[PDB]
Amino acid sequence: TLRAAVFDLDGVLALPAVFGVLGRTEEALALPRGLLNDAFQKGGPEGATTRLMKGEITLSQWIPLMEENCRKCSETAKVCLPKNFSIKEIFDKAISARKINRPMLQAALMLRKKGFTTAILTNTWLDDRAERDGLAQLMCELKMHFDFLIESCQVGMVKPEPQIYKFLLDTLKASPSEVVFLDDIGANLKPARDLGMVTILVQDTDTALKELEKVTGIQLLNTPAPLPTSCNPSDMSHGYVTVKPRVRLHFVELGSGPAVCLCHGFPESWYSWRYQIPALAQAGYRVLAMDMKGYGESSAPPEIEEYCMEVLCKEMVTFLDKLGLSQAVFIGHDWGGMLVWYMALFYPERVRAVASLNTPFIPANPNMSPLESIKANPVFDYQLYFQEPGVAEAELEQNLSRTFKSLFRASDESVLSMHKVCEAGGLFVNSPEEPSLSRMVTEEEIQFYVQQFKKSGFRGPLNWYRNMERNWKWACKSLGRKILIPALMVTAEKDFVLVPQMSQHMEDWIPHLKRGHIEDCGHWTQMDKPTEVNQILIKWLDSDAR
Amino acid sequence: TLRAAVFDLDGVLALPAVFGVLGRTEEALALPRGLLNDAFQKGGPEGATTRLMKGEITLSQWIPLMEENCRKCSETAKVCLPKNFSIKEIFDKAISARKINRPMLQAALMLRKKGFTTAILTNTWLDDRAERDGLAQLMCELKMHFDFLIESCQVGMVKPEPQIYKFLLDTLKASPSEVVFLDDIGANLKPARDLGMVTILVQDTDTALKELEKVTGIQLLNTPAPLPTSCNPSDMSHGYVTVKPRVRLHFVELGSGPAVCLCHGFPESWYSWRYQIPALAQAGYRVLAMDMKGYGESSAPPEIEEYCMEVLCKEMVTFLDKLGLSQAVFIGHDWGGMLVWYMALFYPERVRAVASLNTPFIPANPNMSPLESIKANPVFDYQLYFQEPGVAEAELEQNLSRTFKSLFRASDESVLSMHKVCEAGGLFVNSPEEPSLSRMVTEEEIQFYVQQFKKSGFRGPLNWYRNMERNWKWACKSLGRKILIPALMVTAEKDFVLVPQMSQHMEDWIPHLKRGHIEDCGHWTQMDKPTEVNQILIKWLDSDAR
Ligand SMILES: COc1ccc(C)cc1S(=O)(=O)NCC1(c2ccccc2)CCN(C(=O)NCc2ccc(C)cc2)CC1
Ligand SMILES: COc1ccc(C)cc1S(=O)(=O)NCC1(c2ccccc2)CCN(C(=O)NCc2ccc(C)cc2)CC1
């Protein structure tokens, strides 16, 4: 019975195979057939290429040896190499052109999802070329999805030597009959076959996957679109900054490039961005996913005034100051969306660009108290219930699992009416004791929120709602301003609290505003429609935030 | 008696004053004298500029109002504005040209060093221009050196209104006679004078500083070159990454730009880079200052094999993988210098560029055991003393303060002969019980090392020396390689263990090697000669690592 799948890199997980470029160059340069592939393999197990693949020498050391091999091969075949013939240029282009074979990676991901141990086994080199980063990036993206990466140049062994296969079985902690081995080179496939591993010769990806699903008994071809890569909290880099004596802010950090600060809503976590973090880092951004003040590993002081927008924003500026960041792109959802608009209004020099999911920017009405303004919208009744300190904390902290299961639901699964909450006397009074699990979340993901909320509870989070008057007076100081920095507003069709119509006047205060819209998407945007969120945010970042 | 100093930004802490550009433009464009400065102040306390300085409107909103004011002013003076007259272009250029007035900042730094409370009080705007980052960066560099930054646009008050001065005294928690106020505008100086603050009208920096030292009784002019900015551990962003089940790595993170990974030596800390961290971040780099395995907040497993170079390097690759970094520039000192050379040899695709302070790259001798190789150099006798598990730990852990005071000394202060250590029976047997404090360190800085070493002791750190045979066999696999990626070797004249002569053959294995050399510098390079270390590293990073 199979329980391990091994994939080659070249011609299997990555295409076009860097191998085929020697034949392509021959044909494009009208050189005798096989001339370059012959110079590439000159000396066999004793030649320059084997020394390279075993890690004896680096790629830059191999380049002049291959050039000398090309010369001897052309001499014997009675031909001439062209004037600006560069092995460096040929391979720079070939490596750069090689991209991940997405359907092959999707199959490896599915097999691992079904409890398979997956590995990459590859004949590769120590790359010290000026342009080595492209390949480093490719290897980084691929490897995170596998249990093991076995590189010939690191192990001092190459395919087809039989020792590398015994090394493979040893790392897999598996007998050969439990292993599928996928390779594009029949000669590299033979020793695995000789040992009794299931083997697949890969030419076209489609046929290889048909062979793979037949042999594993798992659907891999024509399968639905998978969810974006998520985060394992224990595998992340965790950052901590003290912004003032009693207040520290925790964040999760991934990627390189322009700093992107993700600001969650109520009652959430940095983890609400789990589907965005790998995708934005992959897009070329340095992601800083916050635990906002009052949440997770960030400090949660008990004082209401500690959660007014003026202080929350001041601390976010101090956070940038301590990290040595002159700016960050600020992306917020829900209450985090409200914060990001104030960052843009009060600290434009610190905000590279601003984006909000669901939360519209609405200027303060100087002729009405925020209490009157809340009363005007029946959907905002739960906000009045959240006012009295200790009341909502008691209900929300009673059964943590019930709280998150009841809140985190798609538009077609609702358990919660947020209208006539004060009248009913609670958020969950007409809600079941043991709610069903929403399609948007796993049981494990719910338990992560439960564990995060065990530290500080709901006091700090609820305190965000308890500064209406304070926030209103502060926001009135910005009434003569406009947001003129790059800005994106993303509306969610089925968010019944933060409705798309509520954002209709934004153009008056943000004239250059760009928009995104997600159909059949409820309040919990990031987990409801993660693929669409990632597409909208990356397109906007690349065009407007660099 | 004075105990607080307040500085203006424009014309005081930053020059050329953005004010003078209106007069400069008039003269360069042959426009009537004072025409632009007049349009800039049109309406006085009710005009566009005051609304801007109070934060009512942003800089991009003010631009068209100033352009309209320029038009009305030219109309009255019977003149014409030139064809491509742009207020935006004039101010973009002016703000960009404005740089920190270094002698003024040095004086503020000295006053604060002598226990003064320092503050910046400035009439400024909310900057939402496309090029706002330059100013954000300037404001970030300046502000970190002061107790307070009071910006007119954030407080809704401007100089010369008397409320801003009462606000200033309130934040300073000081009576006016305890305050020096430095301003380039006499009108903005008057209300401070009226209240009884000591005032200084700033024209040329030199005279202003003479007035400042006369009034404070502190030498500020012609004073020695100060040390680079250091780090306050509690003010830093602290990062944590799990690289394997029992091993986590801690680092301090500052700045944006290409990732720069600093690797300390024995028996050190991330804190050994305290003088490099602010300078490299200021130079445009993202600094990751490690606590190497076995040190500080990083994990310290007890097993010797956990500290061989192969595993230390593998974990550093995993560290990059978890942070989502395809590469980092690796800068090492001492044992960290040895590690960075192996990173370059075994993982070139992950190393953007490599630099070592003091530690030469010496290839393994395949015809001699590392034990024989150690025995060959009398200065390396202490290394044999470090071999037996528990022996050196006992001596080094007995009195932590004595350990660091005895080790951390300049070339002209030595207490330690590292020759005939085994014979003597210890490192400190001929060393005092209460060593004097080296000029390189404060008592507080010694106590930081003491506290760091209280967690794990010397077992993990000493284990770096206990893998000679393991390291030798691993390094022999790289004997056919060359380091062809960007590389810098920095020698220290007076390091008597890692002597400059020991690096003389490096060119044979690193043909493109660049060099730096520090005269009158002992083993503890970073704290011995920090100004020179910063100069060498920044020049090399900008030219070879981008
Ligand atoms: C413009 O300002 C205001 C104007 C009017 C009112 C009534 C309040 C404010 S406010 O500024 O006081 N509130 C911010 C808020 C907001 C409300 C309206 C507009 C902007 C921001 C954002 C967060 N939000 C919230 O409760 N999310 C949790 C949640 C949990 C579960 C589900 C299914 C949905 C939502 C609603 C309130
Ligand atoms: C080339 O490899 C080797 C070759 C020969 C030998 C004998 C050992 C090795 S080694 O690789 O085993 N040692 C690395 C080492 C190194 C030694 C020589 C060359 C490269 C690296 C770097 C760190 N260093 C050390 O003790 N610093 C602490 C310290 C504390 C206080 C002061 C005043 C000074 C130093 C010396 C040893």
Residues A144 and A277: their CA atoms lie apart, in Å, by 14
Tokens of A96: 């750069």
In which region does residue B456 sit, left (phi positive, over 0), alpha (psi from -120 to 50) or beta (all else)? alpha
Query: Do the chains contact at A237 and B238, CB–CB below 8 Å?
Result: no
Contacts of B279 (CB under 8 A, 6+ apart): B228, B229, B534, B538
DSSP conformational letter for A333 = E
Cβ atoms of B66 and B39 closer than 8 Å: yes
Residues A435 and A406: their CA atoms lie apart, in Å, by 6
Residue type, A239: G
Mutate to test the interface with B, among A135, A290, A326, A345 (most CBs of B within 10 A): A326
Residues A297 and A137: their CA atoms lie apart, in Å, by 31
CA angle (A25 as vertex; A19, A28 as ends), nearest 5: 145
- Alpha-carbon dihedral B392, B397, B402, B407, rounded to 10 degrees: 50
Query: Do the chains contact at B237 and A323, CB–CB below 8 Å?
Result: yes
Write out the H or E segment, with its range, that includes residue B329.
strand B328-333
Angle between helices A468-476 and A309-323 (to 10 degrees): 70
> Over the Cα atoms of chain B, what is R_g?
29
Contacts of A425 (CB under 8 A, 6+ apart): none
> Over the Cα atoms of chain A, what is R_g?
29
Residues B336 and B273: their CA atoms lie apart, in Å, by 12
A325 in contact with B at a CB cutoff of 8 Å? yes
Q: Which of A361, A305, A370, A304 is nearest to A337 (CA)?
A: A361
Domains of chain B: 1-16+97-217 (3.40.50.1000), 17-96 (1.10.150.240), 236-546 (3.40.50.1820)
Residues B353 and B268: their CA atoms lie apart, in Å, by 23
Residue type, B140: C
Contacts of B480 in chain A (CB under 8 A): 51, 56-57, 61
A12-35 as b/e, with b when 16 or more CB fall inside 10 Å?
bbbbebbeebbeebbeeeebeeeb
Q: Is A515 helix (H, G, I), strand (E, B) or coil?
A: strand
- The position carrying tokens 């919208």 is A377
- Residue spans of alpha helices (H) in B324-362: 335-346
Cβ atoms of A116 and B337 closer than 8 Å: no
Q: How far is CA A527 from the centre of its chain?
A: 13
DSSP conformational letter for B302 = S
Q: How far is CA A403 from the centre of its chain?
A: 27
Write out the H or E segment, with its range, that includes residue B63.
helix B59-76
B133 in contact with A at a CB cutoff of 8 Å? yes
Print the SS3 string covering B29-62: CCCCCCHHHHHHCCCHHHCHHHHHHCCCCCHHHH
- The position carrying tokens 């299961």 is A405
Q: Which of B376, B262, B9 is nearest to B159 (CA)?
A: B9
Tokens of A199: 């083997």
Cβ atoms of A519 and A491 closer than 8 Å: no
| Cβ atoms < 10 Å from Cβ of B243 | 20
Cβ atoms of B142 and B105 closer than 8 Å: yes
Q: How far is CA B234 from the centre of its chain?
A: 15
Q: Is B246 helix (H, G, I), strand (E, B) or coil?
A: coil
* DSSP states of B125-160: ----STTTHHHHHHHHHHHTTSSEEEEHHHHT--TT
Residues A193 and A199: their CA atoms lie apart, in Å, by 6
Query: Do the chains contact at B348 and A133, CB–CB below 8 Å?
Result: no
* Nominal resolution (angstroms): 1.9
Residues A463 and A343: their CA atoms lie apart, in Å, by 19
Residues A250 and A233: their CA atoms lie apart, in Å, by 13
Residues B453 and B407: their CA atoms lie apart, in Å, by 14
Q: Which of B137, B144, B484 sits opposite A326 (nearest CB)?
A: B137
Tokens of A522: 């409820």
Long-range contacts of B219-226 (CB under 8 A, 24+ apart): B219/B110, B220/B106, B220/B107, B220/B110, B220/B111, B221/B103, B221/B107, B223/B106, B223/B110, B225/B531, B226/B106, B226/B109, B226/B110
Residues B546 and B542: their CA atoms lie apart, in Å, by 5
Q: How far is CA A539 from the centre of its chain?
A: 15
- The position carrying tokens 């001929």 is B430
Q: Which residue of A has its CA nearest to B545?
A: A130
Contacts of B481 in chain A (CB under 8 A): 56-58, 61, 126
- How far is the CA of A542 from the CAs of A506, B31, B327, B373, in angstroms? 23, 43, 22, 55
| Cβ atoms < 10 Å from Cβ of B124 | 23
Q: Which of B544, B499, B546 is nearest to B521 (CA)?
A: B499
Our mutation pick for probing the ligand 2 site, out of B266, B382, B414, B504, counting the most ligand atoms within 8 A of Cβ, is: B266
Q: Is A15 helix (H, G, I), strand (E, B) or coil?
A: strand
Cβ atoms of A357 and A518 closer than 8 Å: no
Compute the Cα dihedral for A378, A380, A381, A384 and give only its sign: negative
In which region does residue A10 sit, left (phi positive, over 0), alpha (psi from -120 to 50) or beta (all else)? beta
Residues B355 and B37: their CA atoms lie apart, in Å, by 52
Q: Which of A308, A237, A283, A529 is nearest to B241 (CA)?
A: A237
Q: Which of B133, B144, B326 sits opposite A327 (nearest CB)?
A: B133
Atom 18 in ligand 2: which residue has the minimum CA distance? B498
